[PDB]
Amino acid sequence: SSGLVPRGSHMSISRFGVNTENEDHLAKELEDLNKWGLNIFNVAGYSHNRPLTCIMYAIFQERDLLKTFRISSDTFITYMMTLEDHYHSDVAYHNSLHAADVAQSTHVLLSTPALDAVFTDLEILAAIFAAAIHDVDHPGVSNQFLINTNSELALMYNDESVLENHHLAVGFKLLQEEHCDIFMNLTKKQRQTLRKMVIDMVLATDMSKHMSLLADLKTMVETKKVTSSGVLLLDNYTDRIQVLRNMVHCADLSNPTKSLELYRQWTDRIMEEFFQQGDKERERGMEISPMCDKHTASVEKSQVGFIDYIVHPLWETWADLVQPDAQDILDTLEDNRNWYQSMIP
Ligand SMILES: COc1ccc2c(Nc3c(Cl)cncc3Cl)cc(=O)oc2c1OC1CCCC1
Ligand SMILES: [Mg+2]
Ligand SMILES: [Zn+2]
């Protein structure tokens, strides 16, 4: 059988989009599965554009989660393909590629030396799952757009974290489609605890919560306890879920910390989507939102501002918490900032 599937499994790699011509190219790419340098774009190209299902399957075999929580390859692949299918392919940034990137990045962060032996397999399961569903069924417009157009969703959720709540509703609702219950064999107590942790992590991806989230994290860094070997000590549930909230938030905001080659592609996609919203706003006779105007946009300048006000402050604190594990991410982020700095017209 293929090294891409569990030993003795009947699962066909062709089921999740991989041809024999790309098996080796993909397996090579997957040698970087546990590294920040992994190229999710190549993975997507080698799997008929199903990077989420592909990367999640690799992560779950790597972390032995299928065996730990008794999830069969069939159930897993059915759920993942169903979920990936619910990410809008025609949305420039928030499609399954973005989710695959967050999942993969979350996967790498969970293994940072400073956090070793901190999380239970269940917490690990919830973090990666949360990352995978965090933007499912995203429409390509912001919460404010949904609020202004009196979206059914916005009414339903009282204008509070409209998208995020929706991502959660969809992510869990799909567990009920045919052969999609990947949590069937967890105990009742485990499903309850996982639900709560996922809800927590996905709501924290709401940007309007960023400031509050960053503040709490800085407070934790202050009182952090560590072992002789230098490993973080997160005694209680509160500290663990707070770190996980921040971990997924960091993965969501990890574009500028990746190689410049990848970062630039991520930047083109987000700008393209923002412009899509810009056009939608014009078509509906609304005021064009900031940066959603392709005509008065300043891409380079905006990236620098995004890094100075949002990304750098967040990663500087994370780097602080898991010191010195994130120093490289910190340097790459700085190198990338200066590049965009130098490209401003
Ligand atoms: C690579 O460039 C990215 C990538 C992602 C974002 C971004 N992502 C998110 C997140 Cl993390 C959570 N909710 C919504 C968005 Cl759109 C937010 C956000 O405000 O800006 C993002 C961003 O840069 C923006 C494009 C011009 C200035 C800001
Ligand atoms: Mg989101
Ligand atoms: Zn996201």
Experimental method: X-ray
Structural domain spans, the chain: 1-345
The token pair at 246 is 């921040």
Contact 180, 74 (CB under 8 A): no
Report the DSSP beta bridge partners of residue 232. 226
Q: Could you tell which of 270, 275, 276 is best to mutate to test the pocket of ligand 1, judged by most ligand atoms within 8 Å of the CB? A: 270
Query: Where do breaks (C to N over 2.5 Å) occur in the chain, by preceding residue number?
Result: none
Are residues 89 and 135 in contact, defined by beta-carbon separation less than 8 angstroms?
no
Ligand 1 atom at minimal distance to the Cα of residue 267: 1
Q: Which ligand is nearest to the CA of 210?
A: 1
CATH of segment(s) 1-345: 1.10.1300.10
Residue 48 falls in the annotated catalytic set: no
Beta bridge partners of 226: 232
Q: Rounded distance, CA 84 to CA 55, Å?
A: 11
Task: Identify the active-site residue in 94, 166, 210, 312.
Answer: 94
Which residue type occupies 53?
Answer: T
The experimental resolution of this structure, in angstroms, equals 2.6
Q: Where would I find the H helices in the chain?
A: 23-29, 40-45, 51-62, 65-68, 73-84, 96-110, 121-133, 143-148, 152-156, 162-173, 188-203, 210-223, 237-252, 260-283, 299-306, 312-321, 327-343
Residue 146 CA to ligand 2 center (angstroms) comes to 13
CA gap 212, 64 in Å, rounded: 35
